[PDB]
Design a protein around this motif. Structure first.
Motif, PDB file in Angstrom:
ATOM      1  N   UNK A  65       0.825  -1.206   0.000  1.00 47.58           N
ATOM      2  CA  UNK A  65       0.000   0.000   0.000  1.00 47.58           C
ATOM      3  C   UNK A  65       0.868   1.270   0.000  1.00 47.58           C
ATOM      4  N   UNK A  66       1.987   1.196   0.698  1.00 46.81           N
ATOM      5  CA  UNK A  66       2.875   2.334   0.871  1.00 46.81           C
ATOM      6  C   UNK A  66       4.018   2.405  -0.143  1.00 46.81           C
ATOM      7  N   UNK A  67       4.122   1.446  -1.057  1.00 42.29           N
ATOM      8  CA  UNK A  67       5.354   1.348  -1.901  1.00 42.29           C
ATOM      9  C   UNK A  67       5.572   2.623  -2.727  1.00 42.29           C
ATOM     10  N   UNK A  99       3.591   3.419 -12.540  1.00 45.62           N
ATOM     11  CA  UNK A  99       3.558   1.968 -12.785  1.00 45.62           C
ATOM     12  C   UNK A  99       2.817   1.220 -11.684  1.00 45.62           C
ATOM     13  N   UNK A 100       2.958   1.664 -10.434  1.00 45.27           N
ATOM     14  CA  UNK A 100       2.309   1.043  -9.304  1.00 45.27           C
ATOM     15  C   UNK A 100       0.807   1.404  -9.161  1.00 45.27           C
ATOM     16  N   UNK A 101       0.258   2.213 -10.071  1.00 36.54           N
ATOM     17  CA  UNK A 101      -1.112   2.747  -9.913  1.00 36.54           C
ATOM     18  C   UNK A 101      -2.126   1.708  -9.385  1.00 36.54           C
TER      19      UNK A 101
ATOM     20  N   UNK B  79      -3.773   7.491   2.198  1.00 36.22           N
ATOM     21  CA  UNK B  79      -3.824   6.057   2.501  1.00 36.22           C
ATOM     22  C   UNK B  79      -4.939   5.394   1.703  1.00 36.22           C
ATOM     23  N   UNK B  80      -4.718   4.148   1.328  1.00 36.13           N
ATOM     24  CA  UNK B  80      -5.642   3.399   0.466  1.00 36.13           C
ATOM     25  C   UNK B  80      -6.970   3.168   1.196  1.00 36.13           C
ATOM     26  N   UNK B  81      -8.063   3.470   0.523  1.00 35.40           N
ATOM     27  CA  UNK B  81      -9.441   3.198   1.028  1.00 35.40           C
ATOM     28  C   UNK B  81      -9.806   3.840   2.370  1.00 35.40           C
ATOM     29  N   UNK B  93      -2.628  11.831  -8.389  1.00 39.17           N
ATOM     30  CA  UNK B  93      -1.279  12.265  -8.144  1.00 39.17           C
ATOM     31  C   UNK B  93      -0.261  11.277  -8.749  1.00 39.17           C
ATOM     32  N   UNK B  94      -0.522   9.975  -8.635  1.00 40.06           N
ATOM     33  CA  UNK B  94       0.363   8.978  -9.243  1.00 40.06           C
ATOM     34  C   UNK B  94       0.389   9.129 -10.766  1.00 40.06           C
ATOM     35  N   UNK B  95      -0.759   9.402 -11.384  1.00 40.78           N
ATOM     36  CA  UNK B  95      -0.795   9.662 -12.852  1.00 40.78           C
ATOM     37  C   UNK B  95      -0.136  10.982 -13.248  1.00 40.78           C
ATOM     38  N   UNK B  96      -0.412  12.021 -12.485  1.00 42.86           N
ATOM     39  CA  UNK B  96       0.006  13.364 -12.881  1.00 42.86           C
ATOM     40  C   UNK B  96       1.464  13.778 -12.506  1.00 42.86           C
TER      41      UNK B  96
END
Ligand code: HXD
Ligand code: HXD
Ligand code: PER
Ligand code: PER
Ligand code: FE
Ligand code: FE
Lengths: 256, 256
Positions: A65-67, A99-101, B79-81, B93-96
């Motif tokens: 989750x944190x990678x 890549x980790x999306x 954090x996830x979910x 943010x991961x995409x952009x």
């Protein structure tokens, strides 16, 4: 100037300096005992108890989750044109965060195929041996230099993970044991990480070598070695604790 | 549950709640004085002095160079979910972060077309009015909640930048003034940011609204308003200082 520029193929140790080859050798036993671990041989063969499979999936979750957050924290340490290795790191981290999306989503799907719910993942009810890896990863990402933290995460953990995931997938038993309708979705995380020609850890290594140069201090080399071996050793600690639980679970049913 | 889900088109204020529409209205004059600034009207027309063009390019650099780092620092808070807005923010943010990969390089090329070297950029010899924006951006990214820092950066700065870059490009004079062989490379940064249908700030707004919900506190709304207006107001401070230098430079030559 001590500047490194790769001439040979990306994915061969011989393309890197002697010190890097030494580093690989010095970390090789620490790596081996993770990537060839009995737990993965058993998982490959669909042998793992429900208890241990559940502990594995819950325990691994924080790192999964944190990678991309470790990568983000490392990106935050970089500056444009301060050093060629730093430009390489910046660009690579900006590309590889994307890549980790979906990878955490894939882990959630893998987990659900073993009856581990998102609530279970979030609850994190597992032994402390299983959380040590996540604490180390945040600590190095938060406090260490980029070079060391990248070595600990993108090199050590991702490299070992390519290999253990490949081992789990290597004979078809684990995958074939899932019902057909559930299999693609269950196996996706593993499949994404098990791919024979994974340039990711070699790309990370290339960045580390470029940052360090042709003649890093012995002190810097020791810092890298200790960080890489710490990542492996925390994976090993996690796996050893899981196997203690496995032996208990299986023995209980054998004696019943 | 106060949950927001967009029904209407992404890029229309009417698709968002009344409070968000109020927020846009409350920030509108702060925005206007940046996006319609005399400095940009002059730049559009190729009128700016060499001194001011150089100050602009050097002064803007830290924000440009660090922009993906603000995004990284915000990603680190998620954090996830934990919340649907937080999942949206994480993915976006991961995409952009990747989208910005080459943008600092483009600014370096734009700068070089005005005789501003990488060394000049790195030296940062400009008045303090010009650095305030970068300090604010790091402070909010470092210390504020995700929602506030995203509002300050991806919404306020990127939104205003779409508009000022479009204004600079709007009549062809600035671009046509570059020699043909130099033009594509010089104009690339501007062109990448001047694109009529820039969903980026609207996507940021959608994330902010999803985080805040249908009924955020008045206190949270004020925090957003003050952060957005601070970003605009620091852009305005930068532009006002540049125009003071412009008037001096031009007057000196007029009187000579
Ligand atoms: C005993 C090891 C358990 C932790 C494995 C963590 C693997 C992280 C892989 C990285 O690419 C992030 C992800 O995709 O899940
Ligand atoms: C007076 C304003 C000067 C600062 C402009 C900063 C614009 C940042 C745009 C963002 O997309 C990063 C980049 O591409 O340069
Ligand atoms: O990391 O995939
Ligand atoms: O931000 O482009
Ligand atoms: Fe992954
Ligand atoms: Fe940009």
């Amino acid at each position: 100037i001590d500047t490194f520029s790769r001439t040979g193929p990306l994915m061969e140790a011989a393309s890197y300096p002697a010190w890097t080859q030494q580093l690989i050798q010095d970390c090789s036993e620490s790596k081996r005992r993770v990537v060839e671990h009995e737990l993965y041989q058993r998982m490959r063969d669909n042998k793992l108890s429900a208890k241990v499979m559940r502990q594995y999936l819950i325990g691994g979750w924080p790192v999964v989750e944190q990678f991309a957050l470790y990568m983000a924290q490392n990106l935050t340490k970089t500056r444009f044109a301060r050093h060629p290795g730093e430009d390489m790191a910046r660009r690579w981290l900006m590309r590889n965060i994307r890549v980790e999306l979906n990878h955490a989503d894939y882990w959630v799907h893998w987990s659900r195929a073993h009856g581990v719910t998102l609530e279970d993942l979030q609850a994190q009810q597992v032994p402390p041996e299983l959380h040590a890896l996540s604490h180390w990863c945040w600590h190095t990402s938060s406090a260490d230099s980029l070079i060391v933290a990248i070595a600990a995460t993108n090199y050590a953990i991702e490299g070992a993970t390519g290999e253990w995931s490949a081992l789990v997938c290597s004979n078809g038993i684990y995958a074939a044991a899932f019902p057909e309708e559930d299999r693609k979705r269950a196996m996706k995380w593993l499949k994404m990480h098990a791919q024979y020609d994974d340039a990711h850890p070699w790309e990370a290594l290339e960045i580390i070598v470029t940052l360090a140069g042709l003649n890093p201090t012995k002190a810097l080399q020791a810092e890298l070695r200790q960080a890489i071996c710490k990542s492996y050793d925390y994976m090993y600690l996690f796996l050893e604790r899981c196997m203690q639980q496995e032996k208990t679970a299986v023995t209980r049913e054998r004696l019943a």
